[PDB]
Amino acid sequence: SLPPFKTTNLNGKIILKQGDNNCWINACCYQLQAFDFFNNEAWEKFKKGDVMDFVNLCYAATTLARGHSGDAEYLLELMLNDYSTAKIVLAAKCGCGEKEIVLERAVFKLTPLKESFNYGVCGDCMQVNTCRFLSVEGSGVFVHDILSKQTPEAMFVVKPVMHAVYTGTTQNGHYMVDDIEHGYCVDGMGIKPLKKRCYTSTLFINANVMT
């Protein structure tokens, strides 16, 4: 066994010292700490600084060993697969007409911008559905293709509370978290200014959007 990851408790969030390529864990765990509905025996200890049970649980779920890089968005999908804490309604246009798609979930694999986008194909006309957001309610997190340029606040369909941030190669990169609600970027146990770009997720709390 190696020794436990060291921690810091910063403005209500436990954060993990950078070591052994653990940043994907840190990024995911920092987001889970935003959801008061998320819980279990190993998480109750993590919230207090006693982090190795849950951290070990993250390696088990992903089949990865301590020391290997991973994917913070994949890990959020795993841990949140049995939660359903938000509702998103889309309008979907194809050659048959227009219809609504209802998604109830905690993690959504969608881009969180208020523009038009494709999602699925209609099995009666075989065209791709051209889609747009009609509403978002509750709490949850979008996991998404990297937004690598700044995004005007008015473009997000929801008000972001925080974003996983990923810089570098898909091979050789590094995770951090833009904590928008606090005003800084968390990078290991340290603090940096918001990167404002490079975002791989978008977390929202108590959404109540009509568009």
Ligand SMILES: [Zn+2]
């Ligand atoms: Zn159709």
